[PDB]
DNA sequence: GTCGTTAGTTGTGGGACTAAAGGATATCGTGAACCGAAAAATTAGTGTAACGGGTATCCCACAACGCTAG
């Protein structure tokens, strides 16, 4: 869309778009489960799970 | 030789899948410019004090006797 010269790859760049995938990954992902914390063995357990 | 009929597929579509507890999530991408609407803030303008009688109420104090003679 951009003709003018006045354009530097700053203003190409949107943080939102990339912020919004890795969000939605550690949030919504059922692979990114709620840590069983109860004891360090159930912590060992699920990160080997 | 040709056309309708029947039964047995065959592919495809719609409908089921204990009970109890619990129950947190994250959610992009951008084009400009002017006009209208209403909601909000700022500004401009007017003011009493005691007196006469007469009488309604209040608080505050006091009274509500006893004896003698014609």
Do not use: C, W, Y
């Not at 912020?19 to 004891?39: A, C, P, R, Y």
């Amino acid at each position: 869309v951009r003709d003018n010269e006045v354009f530097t790859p700053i203003d190409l760049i949107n943080a939102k778009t990339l912020s919004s995938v890795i969000n939605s990954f550690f949030g919504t992902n059922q692979l990114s489960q709620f840590m069983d914390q109860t004891n360090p063995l159930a912590e060992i357990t699920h990160k080997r799970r």
